[PDB]
Amino acid sequence: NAMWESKFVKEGLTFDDVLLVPAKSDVLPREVSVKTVLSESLQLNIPLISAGMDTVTEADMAIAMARQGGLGIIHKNMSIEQQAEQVDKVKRSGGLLVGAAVGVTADAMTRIDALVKASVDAIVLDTAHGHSQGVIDKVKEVRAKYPSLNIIAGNVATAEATKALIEAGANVVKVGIGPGSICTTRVVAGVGVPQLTAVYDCATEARKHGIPVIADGGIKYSGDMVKALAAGAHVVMLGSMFAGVAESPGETEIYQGRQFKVYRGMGSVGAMELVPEGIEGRVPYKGPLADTVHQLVGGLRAGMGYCGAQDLEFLRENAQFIRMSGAGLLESHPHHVQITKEAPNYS
Amino acid sequence: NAMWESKFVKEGLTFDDVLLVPAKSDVLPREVSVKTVLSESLQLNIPLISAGMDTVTEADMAIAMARQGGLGIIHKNMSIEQQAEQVDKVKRSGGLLVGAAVGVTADAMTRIDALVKASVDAIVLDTAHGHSQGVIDKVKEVRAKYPSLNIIAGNVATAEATKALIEAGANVVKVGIGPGSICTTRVVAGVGVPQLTAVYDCATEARKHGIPVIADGGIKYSGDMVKALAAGAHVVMLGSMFAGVAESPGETEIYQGRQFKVYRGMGSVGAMEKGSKLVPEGIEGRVPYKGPLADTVHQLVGGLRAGMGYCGAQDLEFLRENAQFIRMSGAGLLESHPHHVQITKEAPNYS
Amino acid sequence: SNAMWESKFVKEGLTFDDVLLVPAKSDVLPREVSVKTVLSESLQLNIPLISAGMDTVTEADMAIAMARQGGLGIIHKNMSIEQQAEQVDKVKRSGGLLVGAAVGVTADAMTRIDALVKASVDAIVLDTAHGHSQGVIDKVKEVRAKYPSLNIIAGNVATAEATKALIEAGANVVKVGIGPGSICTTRVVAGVGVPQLTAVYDCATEARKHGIPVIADGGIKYSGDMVKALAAGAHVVMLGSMFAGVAESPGETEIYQGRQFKVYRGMGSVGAMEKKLVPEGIEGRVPYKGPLADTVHQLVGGLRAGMGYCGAQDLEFLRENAQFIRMSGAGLLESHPHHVQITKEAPNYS
Amino acid sequence: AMWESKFVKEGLTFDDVLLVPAKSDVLPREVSVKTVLSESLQLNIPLISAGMDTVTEADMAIAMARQGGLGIIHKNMSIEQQAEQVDKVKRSGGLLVGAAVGVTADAMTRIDALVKASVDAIVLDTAHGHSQGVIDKVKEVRAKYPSLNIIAGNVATAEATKALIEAGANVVKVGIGPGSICTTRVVAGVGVPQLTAVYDCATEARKHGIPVIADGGIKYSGDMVKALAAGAHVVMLGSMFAGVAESPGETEIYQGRQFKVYRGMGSVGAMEKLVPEGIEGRVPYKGPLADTVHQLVGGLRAGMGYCGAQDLEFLRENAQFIRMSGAGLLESHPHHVQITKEAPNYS
Ligand SMILES: O=C(Cn1c(-c2ccccn2)nc2ccccc21)Nc1ccc2ccccc2c1
Ligand SMILES: O=C(Cn1c(-c2ccccn2)nc2ccccc21)Nc1ccc2ccccc2c1
Ligand SMILES: O=C(Cn1c(-c2ccccn2)nc2ccccc21)Nc1ccc2ccccc2c1
Ligand SMILES: O=C(Cn1c(-c2ccccn2)nc2ccccc21)Nc1ccc2ccccc2c1
Numbered sequence A: 001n002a003m004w005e006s007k008f009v010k011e012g013l014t015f016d017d018v019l020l021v022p023a024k025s026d027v028l029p030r031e032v033s034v035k036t037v038l039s040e041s042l043q044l045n046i047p048l049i050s051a052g053m054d055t056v057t058e059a060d061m062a063i064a065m066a067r068q069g070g071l072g073i074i075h076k077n078m079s080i081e082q083q084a085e086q087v088d089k090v091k092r093s094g095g096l097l098v099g100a101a102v103g104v105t106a107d108a109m110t111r112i113d114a115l116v117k118a119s120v121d122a123i124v125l126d127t128a129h130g131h132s133q134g135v136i137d138k139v140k141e142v143r144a145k146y147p148s149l150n151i152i153a154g155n156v157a158t159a160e161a162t163k164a165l166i167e168a169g170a171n172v173v174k175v176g177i178g179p180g181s182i183c184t185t186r187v188v189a190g191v192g193v194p195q196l197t198a199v200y201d202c203a204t205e206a207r208k209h210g211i212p213v214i215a216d217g218g219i220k221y222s223g224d225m226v227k228a229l230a231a232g233a234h235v236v237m238l239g240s241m242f243a244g245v246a247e248s249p250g251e252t253e254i255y256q257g258r259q260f261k262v263y264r265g266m267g268s269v270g271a272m273e274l275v276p277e278g279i280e281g282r283v284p285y286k287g288p289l290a291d292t293v294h295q296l297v298g299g300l301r302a303g304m305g306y307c308g309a310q311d312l313e314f315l316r317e318n319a320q321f322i323r324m325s326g327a328g329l330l331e332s333h334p335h336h337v338q339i340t341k342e343a344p345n346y347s
Numbered sequence B: 001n002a003m004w005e006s007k008f009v010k011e012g013l014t015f016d017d018v019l020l021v022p023a024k025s026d027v028l029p030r031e032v033s034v035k036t037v038l039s040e041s042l043q044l045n046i047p048l049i050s051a052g053m054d055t056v057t058e059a060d061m062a063i064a065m066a067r068q069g070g071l072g073i074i075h076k077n078m079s080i081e082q083q084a085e086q087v088d089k090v091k092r093s094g095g096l097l098v099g100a101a102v103g104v105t106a107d108a109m110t111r112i113d114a115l116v117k118a119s120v121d122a123i124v125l126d127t128a129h130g131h132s133q134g135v136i137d138k139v140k141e142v143r144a145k146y147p148s149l150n151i152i153a154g155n156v157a158t159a160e161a162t163k164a165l166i167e168a169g170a171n172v173v174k175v176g177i178g179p180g181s182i183c184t185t186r187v188v189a190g191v192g193v194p195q196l197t198a199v200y201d202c203a204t205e206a207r208k209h210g211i212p213v214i215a216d217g218g219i220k221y222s223g224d225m226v227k228a229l230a231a232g233a234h235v236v237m238l239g240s241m242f243a244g245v246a247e248s249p250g251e252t253e254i255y256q257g258r259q260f261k262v263y264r265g266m267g268s269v270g271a272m273e274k275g276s277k278l279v280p281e282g283i284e285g286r287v288p289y290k291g292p293l294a295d296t297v298h299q300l301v302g303g304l305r306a307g308m309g310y311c312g313a314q315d316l317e318f319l320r321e322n323a324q325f326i327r328m329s330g331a332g333l334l335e336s337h338p339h340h341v342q343i344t345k346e347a348p349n350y351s
Numbered sequence C: 001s002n003a004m005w006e007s008k009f010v011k012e013g014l015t016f017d018d019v020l021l022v023p024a025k026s027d028v029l030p031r032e033v034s035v036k037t038v039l040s041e042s043l044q045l046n047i048p049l050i051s052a053g054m055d056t057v058t059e060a061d062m063a064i065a066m067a068r069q070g071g072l073g074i075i076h077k078n079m080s081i082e083q084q085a086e087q088v089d090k091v092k093r094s095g096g097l098l099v100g101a102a103v104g105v106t107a108d109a110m111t112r113i114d115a116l117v118k119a120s121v122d123a124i125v126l127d128t129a130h131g132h133s134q135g136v137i138d139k140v141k142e143v144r145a146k147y148p149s150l151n152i153i154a155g156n157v158a159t160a161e162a163t164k165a166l167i168e169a170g171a172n173v174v175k176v177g178i179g180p181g182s183i184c185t186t187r188v189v190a191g192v193g194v195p196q197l198t199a200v201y202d203c204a205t206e207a208r209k210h211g212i213p214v215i216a217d218g219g220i221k222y223s224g225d226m227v228k229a230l231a232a233g234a235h236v237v238m239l240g241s242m243f244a245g246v247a248e249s250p251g252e253t254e255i256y257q258g259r260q261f262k263v264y265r266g267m268g269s270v271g272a273m274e275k276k277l278v279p280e281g282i283e284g285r286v287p288y289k290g291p292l293a294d295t296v297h298q299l300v301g302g303l304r305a306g307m308g309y310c311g312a313q314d315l316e317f318l319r320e321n322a323q324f325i326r327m328s329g330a331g332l333l334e335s336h337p338h339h340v341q342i343t344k345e346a347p348n349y350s
Numbered sequence D: 001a002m003w004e005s006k007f008v009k010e011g012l013t014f015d016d017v018l019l020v021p022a023k024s025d026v027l028p029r030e031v032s033v034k035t036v037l038s039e040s041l042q043l044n045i046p047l048i049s050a051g052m053d054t055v056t057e058a059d060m061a062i063a064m065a066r067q068g069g070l071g072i073i074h075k076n077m078s079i080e081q082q083a084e085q086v087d088k089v090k091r092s093g094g095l096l097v098g099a100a101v102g103v104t105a106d107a108m109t110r111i112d113a114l115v116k117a118s119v120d121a122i123v124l125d126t127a128h129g130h131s132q133g134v135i136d137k138v139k140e141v142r143a144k145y146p147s148l149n150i151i152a153g154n155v156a157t158a159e160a161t162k163a164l165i166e167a168g169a170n171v172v173k174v175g176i177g178p179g180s181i182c183t184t185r186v187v188a189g190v191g192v193p194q195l196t197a198v199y200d201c202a203t204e205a206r207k208h209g210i211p212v213i214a215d216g217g218i219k220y221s222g223d224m225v226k227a228l229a230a231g232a233h234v235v236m237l238g239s240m241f242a243g244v245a246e247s248p249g250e251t252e253i254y255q256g257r258q259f260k261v262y263r264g265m266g267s268v269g270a271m272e273k274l275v276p277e278g279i280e281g282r283v284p285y286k287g288p289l290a291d292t293v294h295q296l297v298g299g300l301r302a303g304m305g306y307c308g309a310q311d312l313e314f315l316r317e318n319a320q321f322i323r324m325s326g327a328g329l330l331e332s333h334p335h336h337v338q339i340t341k342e343a344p345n346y347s
């Protein structure tokens, strides 16, 4: 009867619920450092990872991300031979960093072998429910065979789940159940945790083991990314904000005179070909990845400057939030003004 | 006196106010059990019941519901003779389960007499106010004559009301005051309780007596059903999500080049006129055509299996006794649904 | 002391769309409950409804219709003293019906009140923007002194302190509402107000201690709001917009895009003020709703259903026993129809 | 302790609250609307026009001063041009006029010219008032011009207000992100809900006898009253002054309605004249300033009359708020009635 009475006690927050409180600062946005260390064999210049989705990251995107100082995860919706080849294609081009997504299946180990042979830097054990026993066991099975391999496991949204994956052998934990722009998990199954609260809860546990977390999904604007990092995440994972980029898979298509690209959930009907937990759609074309990355990092620099963070470590450990209502949100966006042109970082 | 200061102390949540929290899980959605026991003689393989509304459930729907593992409540907007024929029709169709709705009226027993002869499996004593004395007196009057008959009573939204119905003879209690898609009770009378809190409060009381509660109304997506079952409900009742299937009463009509089917509240002007001083408490409308019932049901159950899998629930009871929620704001809701992307294809379980 | 500084943001407010009335044990059917109500021995109404004292809401034709329905009408003050006195006499001679008249806080207040009393008016409505103003208190005291037996209704107020002040001044009815008006912009232009349900509840709390009835004025857009207002401690509610489009309300029916509408505007709007201070209301139009009888039946019927759910035999049980439950915006969306295409229009919804 | 305090703070904005009516023996006609920001800076009306290139130049500053207010000459022009603007307002009857200065190396050079032009106040105008550079720049100016009115901003915290007062500023400007044209809270994720920001800053500034300026996010006259009631001596407006005839730029016609350009100083357009923290848009033409001012001051007199405030100091010390939900706000505006004509003080 303790489980019965504790059903509705927990409370969760997401990005649009909060703002970062300005702090004393003697650092300029130009001066701040945005480097992150996921592991001793995996370091990034910028805290950005492109999602391992069929409409987001393949060879070209992974190469582009690695060159902006980020990281790309090759999706698993292709043959083992195809993924190992694309991973190699990224490694061919200057010894850039590259990751590959692997699902929890029978052929999982076989796929990982061809990936490790292709000198992949990290594998992403992707599953909808990262707190499942099957996922945990497969992490252990993989950890045993490759102790020197970077293992990124997810997705989870609780501290209990984070501890479970870390103990299984995961050195990076991916956080996010339902916040995705193309996701319908919370709608069709009713399951999830508000992403900021999820990140905070998991980071609270991950810190105790010196393990980094990845904030994955739900990021609409560059400010959301700053919030995610300040909530405990080392690095974020983006899907929709990279999907309209030239380097992302798919072809540019015209709808009502504008340029779009296909963006679909990996749990959508189209991506599968279980009940679907994703949606299919399109996002505006945005040209080269460099322009989008520049606005994102530039937003992050401004944010860190406001908070007085010389590095992301200070940001995670010192940044304070303040909660706001819907009226606060509307004030936070432009209001009572007819916007006449698009800014490079707004709509 | 002390009632004056307590006017605004109570707080209520609904489906869009919360989310289910993922937990340890050794079970796959493929392997979960979705069966339920409502009574000694009533067992459903899926937790679904189609509403007893004149635009939702008749003989054809009740057959299709039963063949899916669910239950259909034949509506009362027809003669006593007609309703008995349809109950009999569902029964002759291979031993399928079938329910039937009865209103709190003078000739209620007469309707119930003909329903029992036709071997109806359950009777729904449906009122707008389940905590009315007339309904309570009716349940006793029916339990006395038919000690073996499955009686479902409603609608209620408070623990005290559930206690009254259970002690009166009801062996199943139906929860829901105002959450209906077609319902204006809360708007025109100002009375109601947010459904998820209602389900939770009623399930709390009914649990003490070993009595199942039905979550009736307010469910628009499959996730809302999983939340309702996790809140303490044994089964759920759907009107809106069933009103568009092929087996539902009424014919298809065209809007925007696509097909729609009529759906209206039983307290709407149209429904009251067919059934017959009271002011209406529902609206008349239409919902998208969705084809055969099997497709809708498969989506519904599929969402439940996934959600139960997330919670690590091997069966519905574990989910009822262990599932934890987390409260969220409007921003949380906005994030929960798809966002900032233009959808190009309707998903089988989304819009 | 730093008290006033530290208590600035302490209070919280609730409106109709923030709450629901909780269903309770009921030994009564909607057709059996009594909706009658007493404001004073000389002023008893069969239905808890008063039509607002506005130039686009209540004149003689409206006051007569309201009274015949068992309600009350307040003749507005945007006319000469002689005219308003005539309007009262007309209603009073139309079968001996109850009729009220609005009076403002001006120098000629006493003159106008003398005429209305001479015309045998039943209630005087001392109407001002700020009921807790010193000018209002004094005017109430003057009138109570000259007319010890005259019904005095004073407002508007939104706090208990204000309510206590008008009661001690000599008012036997207190009207509540600062800003909730559909037509109002006071909260937008002055930044001043109190969420109407909390307002009614705070003022009723004070007024209960004195046996003074309270009127819930403005903010009511559906019949359920009226039930909530009455359950929050009000004896009677006052309506503007829901009565604005009936046939008996002032103003001819105008045609806008085929559909027939009726002008409804704030008493503090630019147009009304003409018939130094900036506007605190807007000018607009509402759909023509036909005879008052059809609107009243929907409202009363909503109340009967409401009282039925709460197990209230009369309005006194409602005020004393009815409990609310607070809900989020998600709760409100569930409360209204949703995820359906409305094909026809219910007599009591839009 | 720093990690666990991240989400404890709550913030309020204008649309979250209402002013509670109090006992009153004062009529709106009789109230005192004056304000003293310093010994050498007194306003007959609590209004300041924003230092933006689409809000305030010489013509706006003149009109504002003659109404009893103040105009701030923006800095998107040469040192010589700005000194001429200040002089222009000065030879128009000896009117009060302020000028905007940013934190650059040549800031002193510009200030030297503005002082020579007999300016009444210089506004040290930056995105992050709690920056060390801003604090240092305040010290330099105070050390050279001990009698010069220095407005320093912008800030949103008591700690930042304290630091600016300590640095030598004699007026503090409050607001991080509430601006109608502002995207700072969206792109950088940083900010504090304005009404709480004013209150938190006034609480500190009260101790030093320093007045604060509530800058940004005011869309109706009632918002201004709330801002003042929350502790502000005076408010600064942008969008409500940008469609005024005396503002820079000219009138454009779109579908019969007249408009005027309004953009943030952080927008691409203004910067061109880092990533942007504003947008470019347009507001409706409102005609001569006197009409907008009349409505604003009249709403304030209404509010003060409701609160029983004879003067603005009474309002600051005594006015009480009540919190409300989105249903409260919805009720607070006109509702369920189709508006047939524009009121002078509403949309
Ligand atoms: O300067 C701008 C953006 N910006 C603006 C502007 C104007 C009004 C409100 C907000 N920002 N105007 C600009 C003009 C040119 C370049 C950048 C500009 N933003 C920031 C962000 C973080 C900072 C941290 C320490 C010190 C200074 C910082 C500045
Ligand atoms: O696999 C999917 C849906 N799905 C997805 C997907 C991936 C990420 C986020 C959401 N959905 N991709 C799929 C590809 C094929 C079939 C089903 C798929 N959903 C679930 C739901 C509950 C589970 C419980 C235990 C173990 C696994 C569970 C899986
Ligand atoms: O009388 C109006 C506005 N107004 C109205 C009106 C009517 C109903 C609700 C709100 N305002 N009607 C008016 C008619 C003419 C001039 C002003 C008017 N506003 C105020 C505001 C504050 C006051 C403080 C002390 C004393 C009187 C005060 C009056
Ligand atoms: O029965 C209806 C309205 N109504 C409905 C209906 C159906 C489902 C949900 C809500 N209302 N169906 C009707 C059919 C005919 C006449 C009235 C009807 N309303 C009420 C309202 C309050 C009551 C209090 C005590 C006892 C009975 C009460 C009944």
Ligand SMILES: O=c1[nH]cnc2c1ncn2[C@@H]1O[C@H](COP(=O)(O)O)[C@@H](O)[C@H]1O
Residues within 6 Å of the ligand: A051, A052, A053, A155, A176, A178, A179, A180, A181, A182, A183, A184, A185, A216, A217, A218, A219, A237, A238, A239, A240, A241, A264, A265, A266, A267, A268, A277, A278, A279
């Ligand atoms: O179809 C799906 N269903 C649910 N979540 C998904 C699906 N596809 C991708 N995701 C998650 O959502 C993230 C994308 O988030 P975005 O930044 O909102 O696009 C991915 O990195 C995955 O974690």
Ligand SMILES: O=c1[nH]cnc2c1ncn2[C@@H]1O[C@H](COP(=O)(O)O)[C@@H](O)[C@H]1O
Residues within 6 Å of the ligand: B051, B052, B053, B155, B176, B178, B179, B180, B181, B182, B183, B184, B185, B216, B217, B218, B219, B237, B238, B239, B240, B241, B264, B265, B266, B267, B268, B281, B282, B283
């Ligand atoms: O007209 C009515 N007024 C109020 N409630 C109704 C009315 N008609 C049906 N209902 C209830 O609302 C449920 C429909 O829920 P839905 O799934 O949201 O459409 C029904 O099963 C009834 O419990």
Ligand SMILES: O=c1[nH]cnc2c1ncn2[C@@H]1O[C@H](COP(=O)(O)O)[C@@H](O)[C@H]1O
Residues within 6 Å of the ligand: C052, C053, C054, C156, C177, C179, C180, C181, C182, C183, C184, C185, C186, C217, C218, C219, C220, C238, C239, C240, C241, C242, C265, C266, C267, C268, C269, C280, C281, C282
């Ligand atoms: O112009 C005005 N400004 C503010 N309130 C007004 C004005 N005119 C009428 N009111 C109030 O608003 C009520 C109308 O409420 P309604 O039912 O929402 O239309 C009236 O009875 C008055 O109490």
Ligand SMILES: O=c1[nH]cnc2c1ncn2[C@@H]1O[C@H](COP(=O)(O)O)[C@@H](O)[C@H]1O
Residues within 6 Å of the ligand: D050, D051, D052, D154, D175, D177, D178, D179, D180, D181, D182, D183, D184, D215, D216, D217, D218, D236, D237, D238, D239, D240, D263, D264, D265, D266, D267, D277, D278, D279
């Ligand atoms: O580009 C910008 N980014 C952020 N804030 C700005 C920008 N431009 C002006 N502001 C601020 O916003 C205020 C205008 O507020 P408004 O009254 O809401 O339009 C100005 O006085 C500045 O303090």
